[PDB]
Enzyme design. Structure first.
Site, PDB file in Angstrom:
ATOM      1  N   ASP H  55       0.886  -1.464  -0.152  1.00  0.00           N
ATOM      2  CA  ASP H  55       0.008   0.137   0.011  1.00  0.00           C
ATOM      3  C   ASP H  55       0.771   1.325   0.164  1.00  0.00           C
ATOM      4  O   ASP H  55       0.557   2.410   0.536  1.00  0.00           O
ATOM      5  CB  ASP H  55      -0.898   0.045   1.093  1.00  0.00           C
ATOM      6  CG  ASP H  55      -2.062   1.141   1.157  1.00  0.00           C
ATOM      7  OD1 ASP H  55      -2.835   1.008   0.293  1.00  0.00           O
ATOM      8  OD2 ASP H  55      -1.965   2.269   1.767  1.00  0.00           O
ATOM      9  N   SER H  56       2.227   1.103  -0.567  1.00  0.00           N
ATOM     10  CA  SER H  56       2.937   2.382  -0.764  1.00  0.00           C
ATOM     11  C   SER H  56       2.765   2.778  -2.398  1.00  0.00           C
ATOM     12  O   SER H  56       2.143   2.120  -3.195  1.00  0.00           O
ATOM     13  CB  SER H  56       4.411   2.123  -0.725  1.00  0.00           C
ATOM     14  OG  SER H  56       4.598   1.508   0.819  1.00  0.00           O
TER      15      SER H  56
END
Lengths: 205, 62, 62, 109, 242, 145, 91, 124, 43, 339
Positions: H55-56
């Site tokens: 989730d970067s």
């Protein structure tokens, strides 16, 4: 169908304790007839040391479990007989265990006879051959010398081990008394089996 | 922390120059590069449909 | 983000650092972190953090 | 009649103990240092080196931690591990004295 | 990090399994031991290599997550939509230029020689030879009737570090995979050695994608008009029975 | 009571799998075995039934198993019940023994609450003070010396 | 009260005796052979017990000690140069 | 975004005014009543080096320098006096007591730091 | 305010000052992804 | 071969089969607490969009559409009913787990492994041996037992050695056979007092004995060894003695040399390790192993066996509480999938 199970597994319990029956057996119908008429059925056995064990089976609606005086006089009359008593097993219905007065006569009789083991048990403890239950591990009483050797090797006291009540069903079937040691061999999912030693404590009633 | 309108929030992790970002044959390059693995478990289909619709809107000028 | 110091403002009553970044105090090694450090066996770390760095002192008992 | 408290009772200071060392042949604990014991030995030796610095290690290192680790590995560490077995009511304190120069080190390097 | 504009605590994505962490905005504490006693015990007891194997489930904690799980599948895949999954010598060396391990020897290769993903993976697993043979997550009898599985991709076999056949995916290299590649390395070579191979195999998976590509689009989710009629015809059967 | 045993409100029929040693010593899985899974627990009620094997009655109640079988069978019952809650992505087996062995070390099934701690460890006041209510524990400790 | 090890452990302890001047290992004479086992495991080479190929590990240990000494001396020279240069710049 | 149209007239605490905002290419009916807050960033749905995992996201540095999601962040300092005890003014070292260690009192002008100067850590 | 009110709850003496602790020499920041760092390394 | 969404799910990287079906085919029946949408809107209506006593399945949470095709207003409301449960249970998965976690630790934390590998409370035994095996959870290997599932005829086909006619090998097979019976008897009993805990021929043991034999055979230059009667007999004596002295791993090398009596509960601890060693070091499985290589195997087995032992003074009560209270987060998260 409690009484039918009692009629077989009380004799199985007597045989498991290695005790010899004194009075000859009777049919089940005569057994229930005596329980209905007299209010209780009495079985006698003798231990290897000739100690006499008398087991009383009390009906659910008997007078001895509702009126404390009846139980008091029954125990008094049984406890002053010329026999080598060592234990009286009082099998009663489970709700009778909750009656305070009956337990009061039981403890008073215990106090009046410091050398006789008085125990009261429910029906469900004598409705199966308890050692043959799959869920119950293998219990075995061990002598004082073996327990002393084990504690001396481990630098342990009897108060440090795990403790099990004397009213515990397999302990009752073994015949363990408070202050004794029971070795339990039990299944394990880590080492395929394990062995523990427990110190027997006083009964819950 | 940045987020889309479909609830897919994220944290800025790397800052690349204009010559290290990927580029198309027509010269288009992204401003944000998000993992394709953010979608399948959260099922934010409205974000993918928005990109498909918005891609044609830019060229059509609408 | 936060990183404070080896020393700073101190609670008057407990002798421990203050609470959070706003008071320029320290951060909390709470109940659950002493459970983990004890589980790992990190006892000299607990002495360094909970005593040397928080409020450790000397008590004299007859 | 249970009477008023006297001076025989009411002592707060516990009586002193006598250290009973189990003979070497009658020991029960393992001949292998645990990771806890090895870590404690290395930490204690490193701190003492940071205090004193006197060591008989033939090799040279620029950190107390490395010197302590090599001392433990080369079996030249001046420490002993005392494993308290039991404190007896009569006063004795039965313990086990183990030499880390003749036990297996669980660490890796 | 010498960059003055960086204010975050950066860590490998495969290290998130220890802390149950992710990068949606989580914050993590960090204190550096200064006492010699606490600094010794941090290195010997509290090192993260000591918890590669979970004390809870007795299995590995770390592995490939979300890009080296699908990256390893593509790298070890037998056939590519553009032919056989091979690469020249130049691109085979480029997969090892980030692993931070010692490079292998490519001297016995012409520039036009072709290397498959199994050979490239093998050169990394020779350092810690293990024995592994299971069925990958790629194969599933649920997908079998509607797919043409490759017979060299449904049987992952490794003997002495040589990836003989099969693909590497969640079953073999995934995080928390009991009996996986990194579980076997830890048991035979140490949990610290397993962590280095997780990073090393992570770079080949990521370096393969640097020019192989992986994306998801809206058309990846769109049924064909003929298949849409088949879906609602199935649903109409459910509503007919209801 | 009419046509039943007290304590159970529903009794279903389930298919369960068991092993059994053949006449050739082979251990085989038997899949065609039917049993009864009931809603509600009464070990003694099903104990008296002549259509049920009394030796292999598996309850989900720790208190009912403790009452009729003992503390050792109650120890195995705590392990089984925690494992069912833990699912399959659960802890190692040795962590389930720690719960059961602690809860059953006094001969009775103690709890993981204030009452249970007071039974296993009556003299550990400081630990008991930290758990639930320091004021109540501190007052009782002073009067009891 | 050990008296004498076995020929296999005799040659293993000979190997450890020769390796002591070469690696952080000191041989002991415990009856259980266990500290020797930990020393061999830590050295990353347990193959002495069954495979008579100890000489290649002896050469490996000599080599590794050689690069260790070389790197140590290089670091000492580098840091003394850095110290002298910083002193010069401070003055 | 534009958190308030009268931001320069306000002294607010912990408020961010993003300079650039865009109407979405795919707008909704909610934008008939409130001002949209954000930008139409060109987004690639791809694996690029493994820096966008878990989730970067990977952000173009050029997009940052050009003002993407850039703005000004405000804080306020509200200090009160005790009537006729305290006062606003620059202290002097030879009279005033327990001055803060490592402080910087020279930036004060008639008790307040002048508008437009850069105040850093340790400055009074 | 009373002496015994300081003990009981989470913000009490036992659970906030004894079982927990405020410490120096500690840092906090948002975490980030970095594929060039080892699993046993932190940026 | 080209679908990004499918390759993410098929390879286990991210997603599952119900995710693709919900995206592409249809959400299906919304099911809260293993039942359909109960009518809370005025006595028989689930929503204002459906009539009272509606019979159609759509009125009770059956979503006929997929995400890619879009949902209608009633389908979105039913989806929000199930979606809100995820948010509610996620919030409870922190507080409710924390209430149970703290109570578990405060009861269990006093349990510490002493110098006997027992678990005690300052004097009082909680376990005679930690985990009844004395091992660490981080040092366990999953290993299959061959003899468990074999019939008596094929037990003799595979594990009875007929090369040497000696009474020693008759006892070796008999010991192999009655270890097979003991494993069956105990774990069939375990199957009896459980709901669905089936017997398995796979155990978690500290040492993978089969791998050690395989590793040494590969690194050894010796191929197929010639038949030697004394070497085969010597190896059997070495294995039998090693299994007899195996329980001394729990004490030290000092008592092993003195041959002092072993406690009963320590003989039971090494029962699984004794069983596996006799299976993997059977005479049939060690025909191509020299007597000198056999010493290496025995030395390596007890090296790994000692390395897996639990440490003195380890707070195992905290370890168990953390290991058991952690899966309660997922158990609480699935609160709406249970009755």
């Amino acid at each position: 169908m409690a009484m039918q199970k009692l009629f077989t597994y009380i004799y199985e319990f007597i045989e498991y304790r290695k005790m010899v029956l004194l009075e000859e057996k009777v049919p089940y119908d005569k057994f229930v007839q005596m329980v209905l008429n007299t209010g209780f059925f009495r079985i006698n056995a003798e231990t290897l040391n000739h100690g006499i064990v008398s087991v009383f089976i009390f009906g659910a609606n008997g007078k001895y479990v509702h009126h404390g005086g009846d139980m008091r006089t029954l125990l008094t009359n049984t406890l002053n007989e010329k026999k080598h008593y060592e234990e009286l097993i009082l099998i009663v219905d489970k709700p009778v265990l909750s009656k305070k007065n009956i337990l009061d006569i039981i403890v008073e009789q215990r106090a009046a006879n410091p050398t006789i083991v008085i125990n009261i048990y429910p029906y469900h403890l004598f409705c199966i051959n308890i050692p043959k239950v799959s869920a119950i591990p293998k219990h075995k009483l061990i002598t004082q010398e073996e327990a002393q050797e084990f504690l001396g090797r481990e630098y342990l006291q009897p108060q440090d081990l795990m403790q099990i009540s004397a009213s515990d069903p397999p302990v009752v079937w073994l015949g363990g008394r408070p202050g004794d040691f029971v070795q339990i061999e039990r299944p394990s999912e880590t080492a395929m089996h394990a062995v523990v030693i427990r110190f027997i404590t006083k009964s819950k009633i | 922390k940045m987020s889309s309108r479909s609830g897919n929030k994220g944290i800025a992790a790397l800052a690349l120059p204009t010559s290290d970002m990927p580029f198309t044959e027509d010269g288009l390059q992204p401003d944000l590069i998000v993992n394709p693995h953010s979608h399948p478990s959260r099922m934010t289909n409205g974000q993918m449909i928005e990109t498909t619709v918005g891609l044609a809107n830019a060229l059509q000028g609408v | 983000r936060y990183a404070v110091a080896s020393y700073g403002p101190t609670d008057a009553l407990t002798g421990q650092p203050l609470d959070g970044k706003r008071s320029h105090g320290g951060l909390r090694l709470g109940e659950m972190e002493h459970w983990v450090l004890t589980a790992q066996g990190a006892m000299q770390t607990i002495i360094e953090k909970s005593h040397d760095d928080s409020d450790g002192c000397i008590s004299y008992i007859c | 009649i249970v009477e008023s408290p006297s001076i025989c009772e009411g002592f707060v200071q516990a009586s002193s103990q006598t250290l009973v060392i189990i003979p070497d042949n009658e020991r029960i604990t393992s001949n292998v240092l645990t990771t806890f014991e090895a870590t404690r030995l290395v930490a204690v030796r490193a701190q003492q080196l940071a205090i004193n610095g006197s060591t008989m290690l033939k090799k040279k290192y620029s950190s107390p931690i490395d010197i302590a680790k090599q001392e433990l590995f080369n079996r030249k560490i001046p420490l002993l591990v005392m494993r308290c077995i039991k404190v007896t009511p009569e006063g004795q304190k039965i313990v086990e004295i183990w030499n880390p120069r003749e036990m297996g080190i669980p660490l890796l390097d | 990090l010498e960059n003055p504009k960086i204010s975050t605590f950066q860590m490998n994505v495969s290290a998130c399994a220890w802390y149950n962490a992710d990068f949606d905005g989580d914050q993590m504490n960090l204190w550096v031991p200064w006492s010699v006693m606490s600094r010794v015990e941090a290195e010997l007891l509290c090192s993260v290599r000591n918890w590669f194997i979970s004390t809870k489930s007795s299995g590995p904690v770390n592995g490939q997550v979300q890009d080296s799980t699908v990256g390893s599948f593509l790298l070890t895949r037998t056939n590519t939509p553009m032919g056989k999954n091979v690469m020249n010598k130049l691109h085979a060396m480029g997969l090892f230029q980030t692993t931070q391990t010692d490079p292998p020897c490519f001297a016995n290769y012409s520039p036009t020689d072709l290397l498959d993903g199994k050979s490239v993976v093998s050169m990394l697993l020779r350092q810690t030879p293990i024995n592994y043979q299971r069925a990958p997550t790629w194969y599933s009898e649920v997908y079998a009737p509607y797919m043409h599985y490759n017979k060299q991709d449904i049987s992952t076999q490794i003997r002495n570090g040589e990836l003989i056949e099969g693909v590497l995916d969640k079953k073999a290299v995934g995080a928390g995979s009991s009996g996986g590649i990194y579980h076997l390395i830890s048991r035979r070579y140490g949990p610290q050695q397993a962590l280095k191979m997780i990073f090393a195999t992570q770079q080949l998976a990521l370096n393969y994608v640097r020019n192989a590509g992986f994306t998801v689009s809206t058309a990846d989710m769109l049924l064909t008009p003929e298949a849409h009629q088949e879906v609602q015809e199935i649903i109409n059967e459910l509503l007919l029975e209801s | 009571t009419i046509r039943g045993i007290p304590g159970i409100k529903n009794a279903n029929v389930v298919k369960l799998m068991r092993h059994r040693v053949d006449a050739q010593g082979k251990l085989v899985r038997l899949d065609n075995i039917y049993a009864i899974k009931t809603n509600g627990t009464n070990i003694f009620g099903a104990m008296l039934d002549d259509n049920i094997d009394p030796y292999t009655i598996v309850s989900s109640s720790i208190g009912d198993t403790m009452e009729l079988y003992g503390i050792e069978a109650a120890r195995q019952k705590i392990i089984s019940e925690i494992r069912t809650v833990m699912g399959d992505k659960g802890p190692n087996h040795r962590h389930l023994l720690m719960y059961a062995d602690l809860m059953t070390r006094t001969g009775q099934v103690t709890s993981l609450e204030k009452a249970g701690l007071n039974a296993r460890e009556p003299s550990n006041v400081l630990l008991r003070m930290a758990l639930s209510s320091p004021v109540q524990v501190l007052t009782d400790a002073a009067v009891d010396s | 009260e050990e008296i004498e090890p076995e020929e296999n452990i005799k040659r293993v302890i000979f190997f450890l005796k020769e390796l002591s001047t070469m690696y952080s290992v000191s041989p002991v004479f415990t009856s259980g052979y266990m500290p020797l086992l930990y020393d061999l495991y830590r050295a990353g080479y347990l193959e002495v017990l069954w495979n008579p190929v100890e000489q290649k590990f002896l050469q490996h240990a000599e080599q590794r000690e050689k690069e260790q000494m070389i790197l140590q001396q290089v670091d000492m020279k580098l840091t003394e140069v850095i110290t002298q240069a910083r002193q010069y710049f401070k003055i | 975004g534009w958190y308030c149209f009268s931001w320069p007239y306000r002294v607010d605490m912990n408020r961010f005014f993003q300079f650039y905002n865009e109407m979405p290419l795919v707008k909704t009916i909610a934008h008939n009543y409130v001002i949209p807050n954000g930008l139409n960033t060109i987004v690639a749905y791809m694996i690029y080096g493994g820096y966008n995992q878990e989730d970067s996201v990977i952000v173009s540095q050029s997009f940052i320098d050009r003002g993407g999601f850039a703005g000004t962040f405000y804080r306020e300092e509200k200090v009160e006096l005790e009537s006729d005890i305290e006062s606003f003014g620059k202290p002097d070292p030879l009279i005033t007591k327990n001055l803060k260690p490592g402080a910087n009192y020279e930036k004060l002008v008639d008790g307040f730091v002048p508008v437009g100067t850069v105040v850093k850590k340790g400055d009074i | 305010p009373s002496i015994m009110r300081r003990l009981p709850r989470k913000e009490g003496r036992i659970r906030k000052s004894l079982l927990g602790s405020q410490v120096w020499s500690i840092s906090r920041s948002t975490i980030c992804g970095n594929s060039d760092l080892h699993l046993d390394e932190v940026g | 071969e080209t679908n990004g969404l499918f390759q993410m799910v098929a390879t286990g990287a991210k997603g599952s089969n119900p995710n693709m079906i919900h995206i592409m085919a249809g959400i299906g029946q919304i099911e809260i607490n293993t039942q359909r949408i109960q009518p809370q809107f005025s006595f028989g209506r689930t929503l204002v969009y459906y009539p009272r006593f509606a019979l159609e399945a759509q009125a009770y949470g059956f979503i006929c559409n997929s995400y890619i095709a879009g949902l209608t207003s009633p389908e979105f409301i039913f989806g929000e009913m199930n979606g809100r449960f995820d948010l509610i249970n996620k919030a409870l998965s922190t507080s409710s787990t924390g209430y149970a976690n703290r109570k578990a630790i405060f009861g269990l934390q006093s349990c510490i492994v002493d110098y006997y590998r027992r678990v005690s409370i300052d004097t009082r035994l909680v376990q005679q041996l930690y985990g009844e095996d004395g091992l660490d959870a981080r040092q366990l290997e999953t290993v299959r037992f061959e003899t468990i599932m074999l019939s008596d005829q094929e037990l003799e086909d595979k594990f009875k050695y007929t090369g040497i006619q000696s009474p020693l090998f008759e006892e070796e097979f008999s010991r192999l056979k009655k270890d097979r019976d003991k494993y069956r008897q105990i774990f069939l009993n375990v199957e009896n007092f459980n709901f669905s805990q089936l017997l398995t021929d796979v155990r978690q043991v500290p040492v993978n004995v089969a791998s050690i034999v395989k590793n040494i055979l590969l690194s050894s230059t010796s191929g197929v060894l010639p038949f030697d009667e004394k070497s085969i007999l010597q190896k059997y004596a070495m294995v039998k003695t090693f299994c007899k002295n195996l329980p001394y791993v729990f004490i030290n090398n000092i008592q092993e040399r003195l041959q002092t009596p072993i406690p009963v509960y320590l003989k039971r601890a090494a029962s699984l390790m004794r069983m596996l060693i006799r299976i993997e070091l059977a005479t049939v499985k060690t025909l191509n192993i020299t007597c000198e290589q056999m010493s290496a195997i025995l030395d390596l087995i007890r090296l790994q066996y000692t390395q897996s032992l639990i440490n003195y003074g380890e707070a195992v009560g905290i370890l168990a509480a953390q290991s058991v209270s952690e899966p309660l987060t997922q158990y609480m998260l699935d609160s709406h999938h249970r009755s």
